[PDB]
Every structure is written in C-alpha cells, then in structure tokens.
C-alpha cells in the first residue's frame, strides 16, 4: 500500500534491487559484466544439471558416460558444449569484470571487492573439478598435480593429500568426491554472489569519472535492463558462433584420451584460463616457492585496495597509471602464451621476467606512480 | 498507412500485442525454418544423405 511493488515482502525485493535501483547515468559497457557473470551462473547451473542426469562418477564409467551423453542423449552434444564453453566465457567475463574494477578503483568498495575475490577463487575451484569429471588425460594429471599442491605444507601436507584422494593415489574415491564437490560449489557461488551484490547496494555503483553520481541517478529499469539485454545478445553471439562452428577451438585435446595412471602426456597444459598461473608456477624452480608464488598470484587481489595512493578514484585522469595498467594487461597476456609453451629457452627466461614483472607492477609501481601523480597535480 | 493501421489494431492494446507476438512467432518459425534448411541443403548439394538416398532405397 499504495503499490504492491514496494510493500510485498518479496516483490519489494525484485523491485528494490533491480527496478527501482539507483544507478549512475554514466556507467559504460564495462559495467555489463556483472549481469553477464550472473547470467552465466544460471546458464552453467542449468546445463550442468542436465548433464549430471547422465554422468556417472566412477573411474570405469566416467569417460564412457560423457561420451554416451553426447552420442546418444538427445541434444546432449549441444548441452555438453554449452556447459564446457560457458566455463570459458564465464572466465573471459570475470576477467573483464575484474579489470574494470581495477582500472576504475571499484576496489575501494572493500567488502564488495573481497567477496568478489572469494567468488573468483570459488569459480576457479569449480571449473577445475568439473574438468576432472570426464576422466580424460588432463582430468587425471590435473587432479594429481593440484591435490599434490598441499604436499608443499610442512608436517601435515602429505596428510592433507590423503583426504583429497581418499586413498594413497588418485582413484575412484577422488572422482566421486569431486563430482559431489562440483555439484555443490556452484550454489555456494550463487549464494555469495547474493552477498557481493548486497554489500554493493550499501554504496551504489561506481562510475567512470569516479565522482559522486548522486546529482544524477536513474532507475535501473528500463535504462540498464535494456542495456543488459543487449550486452547479453552480444556476448552470446561469439559464444554460440564458437560453440556451434568451432567446438574445440578453446579446449585442450588430451582429454580425448582416457586417463592413464602410467603416462603423463608430454604436452600437458591446463585449461586456457589457468595458464597465466601455470606460467608463474614453473618460474620459481623450487617446490615451495612456486607454490607460494602461485597462491599469491591470485591472493594478491586482496592487497589492491590497500595499495591505492592516488587522490583520485579512477585512472580516467591519470595517463601514467593508464600506461602502467595496460602494460600490466599485456604482461598477463604474455604469461598465458608462456604457459602454453615448453620449459625451454627462451621461454624460461621470458617467463621469470613476466612474473617478476607482474608482482612489481602491482606491489611497487602502481602505488609509486600513484604518489608521483599526486605531486604533479600539486597535492 | 500500415504503421498506423498496425499500431491502432495490434500494438496499442497490451493484450492484442501479445496475440501478435504469438501469432507472429508461429508464422516466423515455419518460414525461417524452411528457408534456412533450404539455404543449407543447397549449400551442400549431393553431399547429404537426402541426396545419396535414392541409390540404395527401393525405387
């Protein structure tokens, strides 16, 4: 009363978080990844279930069940595709969603940010174990290496590896507790996503110029609802052009060979979205160091909010930070290439560089150039 | 004037607007389907089993 849009304990929510929501009138297309990320989640989850209804978590049957799911299940092949490629477009989107945040100082929204980082770690874990279910060559050796990471912890380490496998070497128990794990996580994602978006709402969205947009807000609907429908049909076009015309473009082919506990393929590389870390791991020629570097390669995201020195929020008006920012992007773009190459010269050296480069541009440069820029404005 | 005839008869009333989207989606489908299949089969003459077919059939 009056309208049943603002009073109803439920609709007051659909309305109070996506229809009457105060949105800056100038958010650019770099703000459309939030929804695309969201949409993925629902799409992934849906196609996922459809598949879970034909998968069979057991070494002696995992591979052939996926194979059957495709060749026999009506449209199974399409669903398999959509699910596998959605994993990619999900990462693409999450990466741009992150950059945007970095380039426009959205990380100043600490909780909204930290939850985000948590989301990223979760999505990664998820996409990882999903990749293991078909029990192919990568599936197996992937499972072997990653669970082996804990072995880097002193004392326990190995102990922790026993659980992870459920035995004394990857096998069936690992496969089933992974399927359980994969089935579960996506929901925890959806759950946290809700918190992410709740912390957000306390403050409101940020905008390109990085100055209060209270003087000019607009109702999410129809402005951004329409803008998001459109931003959807765009991501959707290459996602489908890819999944329909060139299915395996984005994916490693080693997973077409049923796992062999005795043979590690010579060209063993992770799913494309992990390469950059895989690259850093192989830089440090020491067990524990490579592990720590790897961990920090993502965990470093938690430090960003604290390494902000500029007196301005975004890099729209900071040409030096910009260059450094774009130099950082190309920096990652390189590590990805490195990760897709063997551990031989010139690669090994180029690698250690880009890594060293990565951690410096973030821990030392950015906060420095930032301070510098402040003085150039006379602050 | 179709735009006016249409607006006045179809797009104005939010109820008739729906009937149009349905009635329309039906026609659009049946036609867009033939067309595309027609385009595709043509682009692959004599390669589909629809073509080879007569060689081992009956008559």
């Amino acid at each position: 009363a009056p309208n049943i849009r603002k009073s109803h304990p439920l609709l007051k929510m659909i309305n109070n978080s996506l229809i009457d929501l105060p949105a800056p009138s100038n958010i650019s297309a770099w703000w459309n990844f939030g929804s695309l990320l969201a949409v993925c989640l629902m799409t992934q989850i849906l196609t996922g279930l459809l598949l879970a209804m034909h998968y069979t978590a057991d070494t002696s049957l995992a591979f052939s069940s996926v194979a059957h799911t495709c060749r026999n299940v009506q449209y199974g092949w399409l669903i398999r595709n959509l699910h596998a490629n959605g994993a990619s477009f999900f990462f693409i989107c999450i990466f741009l969603h992150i950059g945007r945040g970095l380039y426009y100082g959205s990380y100043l929204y600490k909780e909204t940010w930290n939850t985000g980082v948590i989301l990223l770690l979760t999505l990664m874990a998820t996409a990882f174990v999903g990749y293991v279910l078909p029990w192919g060559q990568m599936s197996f050796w992937g499972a072997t290496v990653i669970t082996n990471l804990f072995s880097a912890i002193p004392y326990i380490g190995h102990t922790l590896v026993e659980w992870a496998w459920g035995g004394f070497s990857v096998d069936n128990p690992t496969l089933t507790r992974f399927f359980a794990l994969h089935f579960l996580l996506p929901f925890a994602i959806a759950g946290i996503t809700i918190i992410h978006l709740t912390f957000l709402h306390e403050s409101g969205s940020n905008n390109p110029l990085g100055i209060s947009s209270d003087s000019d807000k607009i109702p999410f609907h129809p402005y951004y609802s329409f803008k998001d429908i459109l931003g959807l049909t765009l991501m959707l076009t290459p996602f489908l052009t890819l999944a329909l015309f060139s299915p395996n473009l984005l994916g490693d082919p080693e997973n077409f060979t049923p796992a062999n506990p005795l043979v590690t393929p010579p060209h063993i590389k992770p799913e494309w979205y992990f390469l950059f870390a895989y690259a850093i791991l192989r830089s440090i020629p020491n067990k524990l160091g490579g592990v720590l570097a790897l961990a920090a390669s993502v965990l470093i995201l938690f430090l960003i909010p604290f390494l902000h020195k500029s007196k301005q929020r975004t890099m729209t008006f900071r040409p030096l930070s910009q260059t450094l920012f774009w130099l950082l992007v190309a920096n990652l773009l390189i590590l990805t290439w490195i990760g897709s190459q063997p551990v031989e010269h010139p690669f090994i050296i180029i690698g250690q560089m880009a890594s060293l480069s990565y951690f410096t541009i973030l821990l030392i440069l950015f906060p420095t150039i930032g301070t510098l820029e402040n003085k150039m404005l006379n602050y | 004037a179709l735009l006016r005839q249409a607006y006045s008869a179809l797009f104005r009333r939010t109820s008739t607007f729906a009937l149009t989207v349905v009635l329309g989606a039906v026609l659009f489908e049946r036609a867009f389907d033939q067309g595309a299949d027609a385009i595709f089969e043509h682009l692959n003459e004599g390669k589909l089993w629809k073509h080879i077919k007569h060689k081992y059939e009956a008559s």
């Binding site: 800056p24 009138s25 100038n26 100082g105 100043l108 905008n207 390109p208 110029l209 990085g210 100055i211 209060s212 947009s213 003087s215 000019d216 500029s310 007196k311 301005q312 929020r313 729209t316 008006f317 900071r318 040409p319 820029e373 003085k375 150039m376 404005l377 006379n378 | -």
Partner: protein, 101 residues
C-alpha cells in the same frame, strides 16, 4: 624550480579533466576529509561545483566533451576546496596526536 612548474601544466592537459569543465578539485575522491571540507563550502561555491559535476556526468553518459573553447585552462583553475581541506586535515592531526598523548 620552474621545472615541474611547466611539467604541471603538461600533466594538467594530460589528465584532461578540464575537457569536461571540472576544476582539479572537482575530481578529488570523496574520502572522510574531503566530505567534511565540502560541507564547509559557501552556498554558491557548492552549487557551482555541483553543476560542473552533474554536467560532466551528463557528458560522460553521452560520450562527448566540451568544445575546445570551454575547456578549463591550467592557470584559470580555482582550487576552491584545497584550503578548507588543508584545515580539516589539520584539525584532525591535532586530535589524533592529542589522544595518544
């Protein structure tokens, strides 16, 4: 010396916030001090700063800028908030020090 004094003018045109009609001080990110400062701005100075910003945003939604003529010029940029803010941060350091003391 007159070194970073011409560098400043360069950087100023580099930033480009003047293309929107914003004074260097209209771009400051609103932390706690800045917020206090702004509350101390005289009625008119505040209403002007507001329009400048509400206009820059409208520009940004349209994806345009001001015709070259209207751009702020390095020497005509009024640091309308700088002094207030200085004081706010001043009063604060006093308190901070006085409480550990």
């Amino acid at each position: 010396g007159r070194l970073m004094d011409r560098i400043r003018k360069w950087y100023y045109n580099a930033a480009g916030f003047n293309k929107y009609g914003l004074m260097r001080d209209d771009t400051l990110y609103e932390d706690d001090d800045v917020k206090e400062a702004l509350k101390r701005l005289p009625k008119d100075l505040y209403n002007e700063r507001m329009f400048r910003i509400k206009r820059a945003l409208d520009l940004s939604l349209k994806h345009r800028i001001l015709p070259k003529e209207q751009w702020v010029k390095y020497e005509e940029d009024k640091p309308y908030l700088e002094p207030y803010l200085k004081e706010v941060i001043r009063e604060r350091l006093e308190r901070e020090a006085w409480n550990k003391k």
